[PDB]
Amino acid sequence: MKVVLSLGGSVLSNESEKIREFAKTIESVAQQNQVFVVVGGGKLAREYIKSARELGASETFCDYIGIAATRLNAMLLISAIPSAAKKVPVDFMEAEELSKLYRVVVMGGTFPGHTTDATAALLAEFIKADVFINATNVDGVYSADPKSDTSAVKYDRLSPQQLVEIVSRGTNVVIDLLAAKIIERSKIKTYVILGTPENIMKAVKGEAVGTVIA
Amino acid sequence: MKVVLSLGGSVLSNESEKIREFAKTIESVAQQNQVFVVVGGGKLAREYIKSARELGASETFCDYIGIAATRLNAMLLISAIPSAAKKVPVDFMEAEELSKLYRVVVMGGTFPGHTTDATAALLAEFIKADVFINATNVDGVYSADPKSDTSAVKYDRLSPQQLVEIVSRSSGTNVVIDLLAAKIIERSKIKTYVILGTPENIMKAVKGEAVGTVIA
Amino acid sequence: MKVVLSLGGSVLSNESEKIREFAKTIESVAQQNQVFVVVGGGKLAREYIKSARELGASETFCDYIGIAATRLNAMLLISAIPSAAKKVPVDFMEAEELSKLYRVVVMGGTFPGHTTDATAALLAEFIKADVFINATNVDGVYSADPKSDTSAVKYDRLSPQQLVEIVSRSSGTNVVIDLLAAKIIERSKIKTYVILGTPENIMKAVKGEAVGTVIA
Amino acid sequence: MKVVLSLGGSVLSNESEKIREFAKTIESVAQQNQVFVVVGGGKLAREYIKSARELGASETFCDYIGIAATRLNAMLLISAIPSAAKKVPVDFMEAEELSKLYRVVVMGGTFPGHTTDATAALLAEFIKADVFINATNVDGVYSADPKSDTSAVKYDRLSPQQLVEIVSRGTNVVIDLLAAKIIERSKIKTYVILGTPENIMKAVKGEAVGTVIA
């Protein structure tokens, strides 16, 4: 009922119809429940940090650029969902404050550090979330020897401790180590899924999608 | 084992890391098998045709610019995969010729007409492909109309004839696959996939699993 | 000596080297003088507003996204110039406050309304600027209508009142400078330039020379 | 009367109205005379080579990508000019062949090597051009201590030999050394100018713009 959804980089980079698709799902879940959405920087952030590093930015300043970019993507998503707070919170208190007036709150990053997965895990904990749904571009958590290679299946369920070990332990991560550690501390039922309207809906409805962690 | 992969527009528009991610998958599949890749115009083509129309191009000339663009994207992808033919074929005979010396061939468009899905369907048929993997930005083929709800969903498998019917009635999330592509798939009787184009799904589709919409 | 520079949309959309080229010029001007820079939304804003409108945003909310975008471009530019305030000011008081600690201040938009030219004209007036340099993608202010021939040309100098008249009649290559910008320039009586935004021209305009259209 | 025009990188990167502006001028010059146009890679080439290097391309392959990109920009320009050969020549013979049927020929690069200025200088020589107009983003050739800095004026005229010395001897070049050497050999009246419809027209009409070299 208290959902933290995490939309990573790649997972909806500025395509009008796909964004409409995601928002519609989020709106649906919001009719029944209380949704927090953390968007990531996507192409936008990657691009700009790249360019900003190229121009000789401090890592801290890069960090700011990144957050900015997340906030922008977040704005874009908010356009699409009418029940969302039109304000992009800049911290969790703000995010929770807004949760008292709105069924959907949508934020980018906060602290200039580790990102999105970790950020949303922190948020889930902070607000005592019912379910942390981490919508990524892969289907779940995958074996030692992961990736898009041949020696690979996902784990349909996992313990926190298992997940920690698995990421303790290119290209994209996914789930961050600190995110996992945070999930272990928080004892919050997590999903790691292929981020599509259907799967998100399924995860909300407490079913077998991707990798359940509890 | 003979794979035709289709990477459409949107599906990797010039992001260094994402391209590295796609190449690495294609290279993996190429270690075991024989891969053809057909890239589309993406932002680049859309952008350039848009501008070219704005300046008063003939549709035929827009067509050329489009192919141009596809070929450029294709070159970009080839940088990333070391086992690819450094030539971008300009026709299927070339594409097949190159397939005899390389495990990966990557091409843009050919005939100035219907595109990418159809082009790659044609290529599959031409070379008698084992599997046509159509990596799009949606998850599979979708239901009646369609529009976003729970009772609207993808079809986990389909017959060619079914798929034809599905994209024979519209004129609309089913903006992918093309009608002529589907017709071509029906004629060719080649096992097709319609999937969300990610390295994982592509790998899964190669390994003959449940992804998106399987068509056979 | 107090320079307001205006970099509009198009004028440096995220190309690493071109940005390095602009920064280096701004840093040069900053060695001797006091520089304010107002960047615009470019592709980024156009793109995002386009998408945001498509999704059914209020115009006010589009406005915010636009400002957002400008601010992001501005951040990008700041990476490039080491003598700039690492904060992007969100209003002119901030912008002037920061001008007391830094030789270069770089800002996006402020009020959700008319943009960049007007914004920078306002800023010039606010801080009593010595020179407002409006670096656009055209060469100066242009003649009757206008349309491309030899007898249609730029005006090498102008009075404020003249400029007002020139952009008081249209409703169209004179899509730059804004009407309110011109009105503001007239009120402020601040020496303005309207130029093709290149490092050379900017440097020339700073050094008080014949570039584009001088307005005084 | 036989004009080689050189449009570099930056000088018209895909803006519909500015491209219309350039084409209109080129069309005008073509009413009276015989125009060759060499376009460069601009953002497009820079971007793609960047990405292609990033992905581990050979320098030769980069070279091809670059030419491709030039050819594309060239296509775009041709749309805008009706009296142009709809074919983008891939070599000078082709380029001259087409000159026999068309008043405007527009090409990208040819040999995978030094570029645009040099390419167009070569072309001018090859076809015995009347005037090589090199439309750049700076106003002319500038002093020892050039660039957008304070110790700088342009040279309103120059000898070939002078120009060679000057570039013998960031950021953008401009005029290439080999281009200058080629201009010296060819003894072809050259212009180095700020690439705008007006200046191009002026240069064609044999007037004082930028840096004349003869």
Swiss-Prot record, chains B, C:
Binding-site residues for ATP, renumbered to this chain: G9, S10, G42, R46, T136, N137, Y142, D145
UniProt protein name: Uridylate kinase
Transmembrane segments: none
Subcellular localization: Cytoplasm
Biological role: Catalyzes the reversible phosphorylation of UMP to UDP.
Binding residues annotated for UMP, in chain numbering: G41, D63, T110, F111, P112, G113, H114, T115, T116
Listed InterPro entries: AceGlu_kinase-like_sf (IPR036393), Asp/Glu/Uridylate_kinase (IPR001048), Uridylate_kinase (IPR011817), Uridylate_kinase_arch/spir (IPR011818)
Activity regulation as described: Inhibited by UTP.
Organism for this UniProt entry: Archaeoglobus fulgidus (strain ATCC 49558 / DSM 4304 / JCM 9628 / NBRC 100126 / VC-16)
Family per record: Belongs to the UMP kinase family.
Pathway the protein contributes to: Pyrimidine metabolism; CTP biosynthesis via de novo pathway; UDP from UMP (UMPK route): step 1/1
GO cellular component: cytoplasm
Species classification: Archaea, Methanobacteriati, Methanobacteriota, Archaeoglobi, Archaeoglobales
Gene: pyrH
Gene Ontology MF annotations: ATP binding; UMP kinase activity
Catalytic function, reaction form: UMP + ATP = UDP + ADP
Pfam family, one: AA_kinase
Major localization listed first in the record, in broad terms: cytoplasm
Quaternary structure annotation from Swiss-Prot or TrEMBL: Homohexamer.
